[PDB]
Amino acid sequence: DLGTGLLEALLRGDLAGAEALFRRGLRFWGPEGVLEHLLLPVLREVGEAWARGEIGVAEEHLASTFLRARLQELLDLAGFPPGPPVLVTTPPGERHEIGAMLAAYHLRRKGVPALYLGPDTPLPDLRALARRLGAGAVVLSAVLSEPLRALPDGALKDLAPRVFLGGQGAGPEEARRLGAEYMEDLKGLAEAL
Amino acid sequence: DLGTGLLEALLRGDLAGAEALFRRGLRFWGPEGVLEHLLLPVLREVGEAWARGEIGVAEEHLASTFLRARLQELLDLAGFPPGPPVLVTTPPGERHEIGAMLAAYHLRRKGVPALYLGPDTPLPDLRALARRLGAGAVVLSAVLSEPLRALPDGALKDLAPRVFLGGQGAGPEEARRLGAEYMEDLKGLAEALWL
Amino acid sequence: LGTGLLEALLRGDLAGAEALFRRGLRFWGPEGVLEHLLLPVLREVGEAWARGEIGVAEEHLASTFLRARLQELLDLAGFPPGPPVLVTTPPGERHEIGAMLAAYHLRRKGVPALYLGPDTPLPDLRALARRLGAGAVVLSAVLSEPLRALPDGALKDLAPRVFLGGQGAGPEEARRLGAEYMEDLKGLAEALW
Amino acid sequence: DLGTGLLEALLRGDLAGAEALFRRGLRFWGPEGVLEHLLLPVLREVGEAWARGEIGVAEEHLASTFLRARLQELLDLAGFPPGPPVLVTTPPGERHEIGAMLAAYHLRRKGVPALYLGPDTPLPDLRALARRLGAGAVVLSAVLSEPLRALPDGALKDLAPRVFLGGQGAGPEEARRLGAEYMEDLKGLAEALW
Ligand code: B12
Ligand code: B12
Ligand code: B12
Ligand code: B12
């Protein structure tokens, strides 16, 4: 019920209602749970409604901007330990950022200093920041497959000592082609580190 | 002065330090003060450092993502009062969003329910949402001039009962060509709407 | 917010109190709301009690409310793997918010602080530390009397590191009891790292 | 069995695992059900393990602090309706608080503004807060019998127009002596108020 209620509140511009329903989900499912059982299903349904032609981009934007804000709050409430950061972003041309934010969140919740950069970072710039910050790892979220298919073989090799790639747009073959370690589960990311 | 310290902390990935310095600014200068004297100058300097080749886009992204989060907090503090919403966004092709967020903040501070959509909204979709929600106005932030130049004469005219345009990419002539009311100053935005 | 929050609590307006606390959180940040809102309100409640302006029930109400808010923040910090740091108060010490604050500051810096609750008998504390391979024990003393009740060296070897702080603690008493004295919550994470 | 798994996770200081298992119980049984099928059995078992010398007080504390946090989430989810509050606490000397929290939860679920004070409230102070808030009722949870035995005849009378007493430490005779209405069932609490 909270998912439908939340989507409906957003689609009618009822931010207060949407906030109350999100907080309810947080209290019931917990931090990781609200993301899996509320934030993610609502975003999926928004995307499907858009793809079906039922809503425009403005409705989609409204819901995503709201949910991004909520996730950013949770991100900031997680610990940020000292020590070599893990840089988190998306490939050049990838502007879906919530998957990356989720990765940063799960890492921080497990005591890893994940620096979320925002999406869509050119690889030379990403490499330079990693080298300058002594980053132990880089993590990339790919929602679309096209930004990965545009990259040359081995492009993600050595962005940092460890490079992880995951998301709906990514598969093990593409990761291998690009020279990244493929990760299927957000919970396996912390383990790998 | 906090600006230098804040930028330095960000560029070395010291989020906690950056947050402490921003909070210090908030406690000393207040919300409006910290926006004018800390958030805006740091963003301008990051842009200039990028343009001069001193930092890459990753550093720029980091600072902007951090400052967006801080402004989002302020936006939520300003509240979302009842009444017909004002939709706030940027023109198609404009992905700089902090100006729009600032406009939403200033409106909310004056009791106007500014719904920030995110950036880069197609005009017919924006118009449809305004109609469906009974929005009293639309506000657009233009940082680049090119997204405005791409638009046909009068394109902004009827997005909602009132349409406001401002930002670095906007000027009075272009606003007039596009049929929007041109606004220089964020704080007079709520006044313009009331009047 | 401090006055508004105390006034809301004293009228039994929990919803209003929650709204005002959330405002403080958004403005000051997590550590800031503790320093600028939670701590001043608790000190003022204590002073009002001591002056006979309110009774213990009003004090209970405010502390139970603020404990719940701190517990939320604690749960949102996330819990990293690795040897825990056990956090509690000395036997006879029932003021627990100082201990919760210590656990919070540790978790915010990526230290797995296990908050046990207050008032833990020392043999039981030592046994759990041993059994979990805890790297440290942290004690918050608000009153001085629970420390005075302990024999010389009583806190020695609870764990490889034992830290004592709070209003009821001073360096001489820490030395008598065989604990390391800590003045600042911010120095605690440093000492461990 | 989620109960065994949850207790084991707690006893080894695996908070993340404990939280996951509790959330699983919540998703499966729902709020009332997780209390009956998971929270309460685990607390009872912790007490028995302590009494048998298998665990110390630190393990017991850890489990109850965790489960108190979960119940606090449920209390806040139940919401806090407007109107004259019902104050909920425990007798002076009674430091077991989860029974009181449960009473507050069941009341809130039925639309009663149950204000949970925390445990162990001196009676003059409790009376004064009831007076100051215009409370319609006071509810006390007694786990131990000794805190009640220590109280004078009629000590609970007129804390508010309705005063309820229940829990393992309470019986109808002691309630009568103290001037409280005795309640056996948490679900009967809201009924009794009407
Ligand atoms: C919101 C949204 C947008 C927003 C994003 C705003 C923002 N700042 O993030 C905007 C407006 C920018 C947008 C634009 C477009 N997008 Co879009 N949109 C979405 C939507 C509705 C939600 C996105 C989201 O946050 N979802 C949550 C995602 C990230 O979760 P998830 O992928 O299920 O993630 C899980 C796993 O992948 C894993 N994971 C993710 N990252 C990582 C990383 C690691 C290391 C690991 C281990 C795991 C992991 O974590 C999650 C597990 O719970 C989706 C719908 C959907 N996703 O089903 C589309 C969707 C992805 N978008 C789509 C499209 C087509 C577009 C556009 C092409 C449309 C257009 N031409 O304008 C553009 C492309 C822009 C670009 N260059 O990227 C399509 C893509 C379909 C396809 N055929 O591939 C989708 C699926 C919608 C649809 N049903 O068609 N979009
Ligand atoms: C962060 C940033 C980005 C981020 C944006 C991230 C996000 N927002 O989500 C990213 C990396 C995506 C980015 C990309 C690019 N950007 Co950029 N970057 C910036 C930077 C540093 C941000 C500034 C900011 O957010 N400030 C807040 C804005 C609004 O500041 P402001 O315009 O001074 O705002 C004042 C007024 O305009 C007014 N205002 C603003 N909006 C409104 C609305 C109303 C109604 C009113 C009354 C007032 C008002 O209020 C403010 C205070 O007085 C700026 C530097 C700068 N000086 O702005 C550039 C800058 C704007 N970017 C620039 C460029 C060139 C680009 C790119 C083309 C770079 C590239 N080759 O990829 C792309 C284009 C993306 C697009 N739009 O299509 C240039 C533009 C220069 C120009 N050509 O005019 C700048 C100025 C950097 C520079 N000095 O060279 N950018
Ligand atoms: C709430 C409260 C209670 C509640 C606590 C409920 C709970 N926590 O579960 C209850 C009702 C139980 C209570 C009871 C009593 N308390 Co009382 N009460 C308080 C009150 C109002 C707030 C306590 C609190 O959370 N403070 C927040 C604390 C932690 O803040 P702080 O001490 O300034 O802590 C800072 C530093 O110490 C540091 N820190 C803390 N711990 C640690 C640990 C480390 C390692 C480090 C580095 C730093 C650190 O962090 C904080 C911020 O910097 C205070 C008022 C006050 N001034 O504190 C009294 C107060 C502590 N109580 C007091 C008294 C006298 C009592 C009782 C004896 C009275 C009574 N009989 O009712 C009992 C004793 C119970 C017992 N312990 O055995 C007095 C103590 C005065 C004295 N002589 O020392 C106080 C000061 C009130 C007063 N003005 O008289 N109390
Ligand atoms: C956690 C706990 C503690 C914690 C409590 C922390 C806290 N903040 O709550 C701590 C460590 C502080 C503690 C201390 C002690 N406790 Co203890 N501990 C427990 C334990 C394991 C769980 C308590 C709990 O939350 N129970 C959940 C409750 C609510 O379940 P329940 O009581 O069956 O309640 C049901 C009904 O009574 C009803 N109900 C409850 N309240 C109300 C009110 C109304 C109006 C209604 C209608 C119904 C109702 O609803 C509940 C669900 O059906 C129990 C084990 C147990 N079986 O209860 C003991 C237990 C209660 N403790 C016990 C003892 C002995 C102690 C100590 C004396 C030990 C000591 N030597 O120091 C002290 C006394 C402290 C004090 N002065 O109050 C004994 C009491 C035995 C007895 N009476 O003879 C128990 C039974 C353990 C055992 N021996 O097996 N304890």
PDB file of N, CA, C and O in Angstrom, chain B residues 126-155:
ATOM      1  N   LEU B 126       5.924  19.993 -19.234  1.00  0.00           N
ATOM      2  CA  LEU B 126       5.850  20.954 -18.140  1.00  0.00           C
ATOM      3  C   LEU B 126       4.475  21.634 -18.142  1.00  0.00           C
ATOM      4  O   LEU B 126       3.854  21.784 -17.111  1.00  0.00           O
ATOM      5  N   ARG B 127       4.019  22.047 -19.322  1.00  0.00           N
ATOM      6  CA  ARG B 127       2.731  22.701 -19.480  1.00  0.00           C
ATOM      7  C   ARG B 127       1.606  21.772 -19.013  1.00  0.00           C
ATOM      8  O   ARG B 127       0.687  22.203 -18.300  1.00  0.00           O
ATOM      9  N   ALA B 128       1.686  20.495 -19.402  1.00  0.00           N
ATOM     10  CA  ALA B 128       0.650  19.527 -19.043  1.00  0.00           C
ATOM     11  C   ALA B 128       0.581  19.348 -17.524  1.00  0.00           C
ATOM     12  O   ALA B 128      -0.519  19.286 -16.963  1.00  0.00           O
ATOM     13  N   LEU B 129       1.746  19.254 -16.861  1.00  0.00           N
ATOM     14  CA  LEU B 129       1.755  19.079 -15.417  1.00  0.00           C
ATOM     15  C   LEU B 129       1.193  20.325 -14.726  1.00  0.00           C
ATOM     16  O   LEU B 129       0.422  20.199 -13.786  1.00  0.00           O
ATOM     17  N   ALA B 130       1.586  21.516 -15.201  1.00  0.00           N
ATOM     18  CA  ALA B 130       1.073  22.768 -14.655  1.00  0.00           C
ATOM     19  C   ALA B 130      -0.455  22.800 -14.713  1.00  0.00           C
ATOM     20  O   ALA B 130      -1.111  23.115 -13.707  1.00  0.00           O
ATOM     21  N   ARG B 131      -1.008  22.416 -15.867  1.00  0.00           N
ATOM     22  CA  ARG B 131      -2.472  22.350 -16.089  1.00  0.00           C
ATOM     23  C   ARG B 131      -3.077  21.341 -15.113  1.00  0.00           C
ATOM     24  O   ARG B 131      -4.009  21.695 -14.400  1.00  0.00           O
ATOM     25  N   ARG B 132      -2.462  20.170 -15.032  1.00  0.00           N
ATOM     26  CA  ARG B 132      -3.092  19.112 -14.258  1.00  0.00           C
ATOM     27  C   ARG B 132      -3.073  19.429 -12.761  1.00  0.00           C
ATOM     28  O   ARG B 132      -3.994  19.051 -12.034  1.00  0.00           O
ATOM     29  N   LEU B 133      -2.024  20.115 -12.285  1.00  0.00           N
ATOM     30  CA  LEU B 133      -1.917  20.424 -10.864  1.00  0.00           C
ATOM     31  C   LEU B 133      -2.558  21.773 -10.533  1.00  0.00           C
ATOM     32  O   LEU B 133      -2.601  22.148  -9.367  1.00  0.00           O
ATOM     33  N   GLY B 134      -3.016  22.517 -11.546  1.00  0.00           N
ATOM     34  CA  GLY B 134      -3.498  23.870 -11.321  1.00  0.00           C
ATOM     35  C   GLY B 134      -2.400  24.763 -10.751  1.00  0.00           C
ATOM     36  O   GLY B 134      -2.642  25.567  -9.854  1.00  0.00           O
ATOM     37  N   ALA B 135      -1.180  24.623 -11.285  1.00  0.00           N
ATOM     38  CA  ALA B 135      -0.073  25.476 -10.890  1.00  0.00           C
ATOM     39  C   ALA B 135      -0.377  26.949 -11.172  1.00  0.00           C
ATOM     40  O   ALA B 135      -0.879  27.278 -12.230  1.00  0.00           O
ATOM     41  N   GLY B 136      -0.026  27.827 -10.213  1.00  0.00           N
ATOM     42  CA  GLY B 136      -0.172  29.269 -10.385  1.00  0.00           C
ATOM     43  C   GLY B 136       0.946  29.848 -11.250  1.00  0.00           C
ATOM     44  O   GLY B 136       0.752  30.849 -11.941  1.00  0.00           O
ATOM     45  N   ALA B 137       2.104  29.170 -11.295  1.00  0.00           N
ATOM     46  CA  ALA B 137       3.220  29.683 -12.061  1.00  0.00           C
ATOM     47  C   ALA B 137       4.222  28.585 -12.388  1.00  0.00           C
ATOM     48  O   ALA B 137       4.214  27.504 -11.797  1.00  0.00           O
ATOM     49  N   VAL B 138       5.088  28.926 -13.345  1.00  0.00           N
ATOM     50  CA  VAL B 138       6.290  28.200 -13.658  1.00  0.00           C
ATOM     51  C   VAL B 138       7.457  29.170 -13.530  1.00  0.00           C
ATOM     52  O   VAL B 138       7.348  30.349 -13.924  1.00  0.00           O
ATOM     53  N   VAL B 139       8.560  28.658 -12.973  1.00  0.00           N
ATOM     54  CA  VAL B 139       9.793  29.415 -12.866  1.00  0.00           C
ATOM     55  C   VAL B 139      10.910  28.612 -13.517  1.00  0.00           C
ATOM     56  O   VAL B 139      11.108  27.438 -13.180  1.00  0.00           O
ATOM     57  N   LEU B 140      11.695  29.270 -14.391  1.00  0.00           N
ATOM     58  CA  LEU B 140      12.789  28.615 -15.061  1.00  0.00           C
ATOM     59  C   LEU B 140      14.105  29.317 -14.741  1.00  0.00           C
ATOM     60  O   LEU B 140      14.187  30.542 -14.818  1.00  0.00           O
ATOM     61  N   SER B 141      15.135  28.500 -14.476  1.00  0.00           N
ATOM     62  CA  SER B 141      16.507  28.964 -14.326  1.00  0.00           C
ATOM     63  C   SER B 141      17.305  28.588 -15.566  1.00  0.00           C
ATOM     64  O   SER B 141      17.373  27.412 -15.924  1.00  0.00           O
ATOM     65  N   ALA B 142      17.910  29.594 -16.195  1.00  0.00           N
ATOM     66  CA  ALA B 142      18.751  29.406 -17.366  1.00  0.00           C
ATOM     67  C   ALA B 142      20.169  29.826 -17.000  1.00  0.00           C
ATOM     68  O   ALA B 142      20.408  30.985 -16.733  1.00  0.00           O
ATOM     69  N   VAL B 143      21.100  28.869 -17.007  1.00  0.00           N
ATOM     70  CA  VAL B 143      22.494  29.161 -16.721  1.00  0.00           C
ATOM     71  C   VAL B 143      23.214  29.396 -18.044  1.00  0.00           C
ATOM     72  O   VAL B 143      23.884  30.409 -18.189  1.00  0.00           O
ATOM     73  N   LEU B 144      23.043  28.475 -19.000  1.00  0.00           N
ATOM     74  CA  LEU B 144      23.521  28.626 -20.370  1.00  0.00           C
ATOM     75  C   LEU B 144      22.517  29.448 -21.171  1.00  0.00           C
ATOM     76  O   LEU B 144      21.324  29.412 -20.882  1.00  0.00           O
ATOM     77  N   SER B 145      22.991  30.145 -22.197  1.00  0.00           N
ATOM     78  CA  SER B 145      22.112  30.904 -23.071  1.00  0.00           C
ATOM     79  C   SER B 145      21.597  30.035 -24.224  1.00  0.00           C
ATOM     80  O   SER B 145      20.519  30.290 -24.750  1.00  0.00           O
ATOM     81  N   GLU B 146      22.332  28.987 -24.590  1.00  0.00           N
ATOM     82  CA  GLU B 146      22.021  28.203 -25.779  1.00  0.00           C
ATOM     83  C   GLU B 146      20.647  27.526 -25.667  1.00  0.00           C
ATOM     84  O   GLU B 146      19.900  27.485 -26.641  1.00  0.00           O
ATOM     85  N   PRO B 147      20.243  26.928 -24.524  1.00  0.00           N
ATOM     86  CA  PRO B 147      18.913  26.325 -24.442  1.00  0.00           C
ATOM     87  C   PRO B 147      17.779  27.309 -24.742  1.00  0.00           C
ATOM     88  O   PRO B 147      16.769  26.911 -25.297  1.00  0.00           O
ATOM     89  N   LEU B 148      17.957  28.591 -24.423  1.00  0.00           N
ATOM     90  CA  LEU B 148      16.938  29.610 -24.695  1.00  0.00           C
ATOM     91  C   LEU B 148      16.920  29.954 -26.179  1.00  0.00           C
ATOM     92  O   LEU B 148      15.858  30.100 -26.774  1.00  0.00           O
ATOM     93  N   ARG B 149      18.109  30.082 -26.774  1.00  0.00           N
ATOM     94  CA  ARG B 149      18.221  30.436 -28.173  1.00  0.00           C
ATOM     95  C   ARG B 149      17.574  29.365 -29.053  1.00  0.00           C
ATOM     96  O   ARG B 149      17.086  29.668 -30.141  1.00  0.00           O
ATOM     97  N   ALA B 150      17.562  28.115 -28.575  1.00  0.00           N
ATOM     98  CA  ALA B 150      16.995  27.000 -29.324  1.00  0.00           C
ATOM     99  C   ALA B 150      15.462  27.055 -29.353  1.00  0.00           C
ATOM    100  O   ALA B 150      14.835  26.351 -30.141  1.00  0.00           O
ATOM    101  N   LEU B 151      14.852  27.841 -28.459  1.00  0.00           N
ATOM    102  CA  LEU B 151      13.406  27.853 -28.309  1.00  0.00           C
ATOM    103  C   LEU B 151      12.791  28.850 -29.276  1.00  0.00           C
ATOM    104  O   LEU B 151      13.362  29.907 -29.544  1.00  0.00           O
ATOM    105  N   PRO B 152      11.599  28.529 -29.824  1.00  0.00           N
ATOM    106  CA  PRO B 152      10.880  29.445 -30.700  1.00  0.00           C
ATOM    107  C   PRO B 152      10.283  30.638 -29.962  1.00  0.00           C
ATOM    108  O   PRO B 152       9.986  30.572 -28.762  1.00  0.00           O
ATOM    109  N   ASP B 153      10.068  31.713 -30.708  1.00  0.00           N
ATOM    110  CA  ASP B 153       9.422  32.892 -30.158  1.00  0.00           C
ATOM    111  C   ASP B 153       8.148  32.480 -29.417  1.00  0.00           C
ATOM    112  O   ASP B 153       7.351  31.697 -29.927  1.00  0.00           O
ATOM    113  N   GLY B 154       7.981  33.020 -28.197  1.00  0.00           N
ATOM    114  CA  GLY B 154       6.771  32.854 -27.409  1.00  0.00           C
ATOM    115  C   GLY B 154       6.630  31.474 -26.760  1.00  0.00           C
ATOM    116  O   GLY B 154       5.562  31.159 -26.243  1.00  0.00           O
ATOM    117  N   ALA B 155       7.691  30.663 -26.772  1.00  0.00           N
ATOM    118  CA  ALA B 155       7.611  29.280 -26.310  1.00  0.00           C
ATOM    119  C   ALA B 155       7.252  29.187 -24.829  1.00  0.00           C
ATOM    120  O   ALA B 155       6.694  28.182 -24.402  1.00  0.00           O
TER     121      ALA B 155
END
